[PDB]
Amino acid sequence: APAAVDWRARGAVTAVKDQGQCGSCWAFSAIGNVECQWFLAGHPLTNLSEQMLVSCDKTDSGCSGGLMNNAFEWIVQENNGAVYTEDSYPYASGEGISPPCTTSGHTVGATITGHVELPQDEAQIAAWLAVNGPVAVAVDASSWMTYTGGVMTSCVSEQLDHGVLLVGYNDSAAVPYWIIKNSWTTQWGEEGYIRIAKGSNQCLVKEEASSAVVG
Ligand SMILES: C[C@@H](/C=C/C(=O)C=O)NC(=O)[C@@H](Cc1ccccc1)NC(=O)OCc1ccccc1
Numbered sequence: 001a002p003a004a005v006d007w008r009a010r011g012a013v014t015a016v017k018d019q020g021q022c023g024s025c026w027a028f029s030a031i032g033n034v035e036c037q038w039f040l041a042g043h044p045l046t047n048l049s050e051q052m053l054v055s056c057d058k059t060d061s062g063c064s065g066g067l068m069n070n071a072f073e074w075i076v077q078e079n080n081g082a083v084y085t086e087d088s089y090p091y092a093s094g095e096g097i098s099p100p101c102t103t104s105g106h107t108v109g110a111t112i113t114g115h116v117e118l119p120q121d122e123a124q125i126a127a128w129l130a131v132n133g134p135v136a137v138a139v140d141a142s143s144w145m146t147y148t149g150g151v152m153t154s155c156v157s158e159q160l161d162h163g164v165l166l167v168g169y170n171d172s173a174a175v176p177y178w179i180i181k182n183s184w185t186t187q188w189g190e191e192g193y194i195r196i197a198k199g200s201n202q203c204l205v206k207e208e209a210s211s212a213v214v215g
Contacts (some may be wrong), residue, residue: 001123001130006168012039012133013167014047016192019183020094024065027053028183029163033068033136034075034212036165038110040133041214044124046109052079054093056101059092063096068136068163072115072212081215085109111215118209122198125209126169129139134181137165138208144182144194151177151195155203166209169198178205 007013014035019028027050039045053060057074060066075081088107092099118125118135129135141162143155153175169180176198186192196202 001127001171003172004168005126005130006170007036007134008179011045012036013165013181014183017050017091017183018094018185019050020091021096021107022054022063022093022098023065023096024050024054024063024093024098025163025183026060026071027057027066029136029138029165030068030071031083032165032181032183033134033210034110034112034214036134036167037112037179037214038083038213040092043110044201045046048109049084049086049089049091049106051089051091051093051098052106054098056103058101062098068138068208069115069117069210071136072112072210075112075212076114081111081113082108083112088108096116099171112212113215114213116211116213118211120133120206120209122201122206124199125166125206126171129166132211135209135211136163137166137180138163139165139180139203139205141203143203147194149190151175151197152202155195155196157204160187160204160207166205167177171198
């Protein structure tokens, strides 16, 4: 693999967003991966809609939870591959209550044709990411409310409970790390990002990695 990749340097990652009090991390994980994957297919970077998934994806549980994988499939299977612009379908669940789904008034800002699930092995995730772009991962985020910056080297690794977006890694640093886009505003961590040590399954990062595939 290359020694270091950071997809933010390529103009491929949109701004840090804010899930608020809704348990919608899954939606932010998956839509973040679709924004990136769409850019990489040769389109302008477009902000896309989590509210679409939170409100309309009935194969997931709204502000109670969901799986990035079900979100991918619901897009392809039930919404004709369409992902709405964030503009045409703004986030309205900051309070922990999602409104009812609306099937009109929106504009398509990306489409996808499916998703891949990556192996449970950090070296192999990194290989895939190096080439194909940012990846949705699940993590144990228990530790993460105390996080203020730097590379974290000890992470409570017991149960997956949060969905985030893996955007780069650096193997040449004193402690190899992953670069992870979180959805708790820019007020948290490194301007909305976290860096966690790579190679030791910090936060169970290898366990549930996957990506949308665009046309
Ligand atoms: C509550 C929410 C985000 C929460 C936070 O903001 C907590 O920090 N977590 C989730 O939605 C996800 C995180 C996750 C994603 C992928 C694999 C493993 C876990 N948790 C989650 O529990 O999904 C449950 C579920 C399963 C099937 C159908 C509906 C719901």
